[PDB]
Structure 1
Amino acid sequence: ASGMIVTDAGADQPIVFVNRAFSTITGYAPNEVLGRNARFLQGPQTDAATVARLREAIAAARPIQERILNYRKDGQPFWNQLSISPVRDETGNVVAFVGVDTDV
């Protein structure tokens, strides 16, 4: 099943909701991640250029997909097939971001 992360729009996009698959994939429980920016999933071999593309897309509220190296709670690396998009109201204000880690 595909993981899902919901964040606030501002103040460094703290995580406000994760689905069950997020915990299966990453080994983190919700209480270990709520209120944190999702960048804690990154580690030593994460590609800096990929991180910079995510940073620019979120700053501009642009949809983006990246295959990014992340790390489980136990330190094991995994490929995250990540897609992020903004959630907007009908006046175009960004209410939240949603990220998905696609299962295969």
Structure 2
Amino acid sequence: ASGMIVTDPGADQPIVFVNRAFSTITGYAPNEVLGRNARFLQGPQTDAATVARLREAIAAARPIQERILNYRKDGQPFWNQLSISPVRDETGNVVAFVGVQTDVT
């Protein structure tokens, strides 16, 4: 089952919702991720160029997919097949961001 993260659109995109699979994949409970930017999932061997591509896509509200090294709560590395998309209203305003995570380790 694929993980899902929903964030606010503005400020530093704090997490507002995660599904059950997110907790299975990452080892984090909803309570200890809500209100935080998802970058806490990154660690020492995370590719800086990949992070920079995500940063630019989110700033521009462009859809992007990356295979990125992430870390479970316990510190074990896993490969995250990550896809991020903006959620827009009819006038094109960004209402939220949705991220979908697949463990492809």
Cα separation, 1, equivalents of 2:91 and 2:27: 38
- CA offset at residue 103 of structure 1? 5.0
Greater displacement, 80-89 / 94-103: 94-103
The TM-score with structure 1 as length reference comes to 0.98
- Cα deviation code 1:19-49 (max 9, x no counterpart): 0000000000000100000000000000000
Cα separation, 2, equivalents of 1:11 and 1:52: 17
* Contact 2:50 2:68 (C-alpha < 8 Å) held by counterparts: yes
- Cα deviation code 1:37-85 (max 9, x no counterpart): 0000000000000000000000000000000000000000000000000
* Contact 2:80 2:101 (C-alpha < 8 Å) held by counterparts: yes
Cα separation, 2, equivalents of 1:89 and 1:78: 34
- CA offset at residue 102 of structure 1? 2.6
Q: Kindly, what percent of the aligned residue pairs are identical?
A: 98
Q: Which runs of 4+ in 1 moved over 3 A?
A: none
Q: Secondary structure at the match of 1:22?
A: helix
* Contact 2:79 2:103 (C-alpha < 8 Å) held by counterparts: no
Root-mean-square deviation (Å)? 0.7
Cα separation, 1, equivalents of 2:18 and 2:70: 16
Aligned counterpart, 2:76: 76
Cα separation, 1, equivalents of 2:57 and 2:73: 26
Q: 1:103 to 1:40 in 2, by over 3 A?
A: closer
Q: Secondary structure at the match of 2:57?
A: helix
Written as runs of structure 1 = structure 2, the 5 A alignment for 1:1-104 is: 1-102=1-102, 104=104
Q: Give the paired residue count.
A: 104
Cα separation, 2, equivalents of 1:77 and 1:7: 23
Gaps of 5+ in 2: none
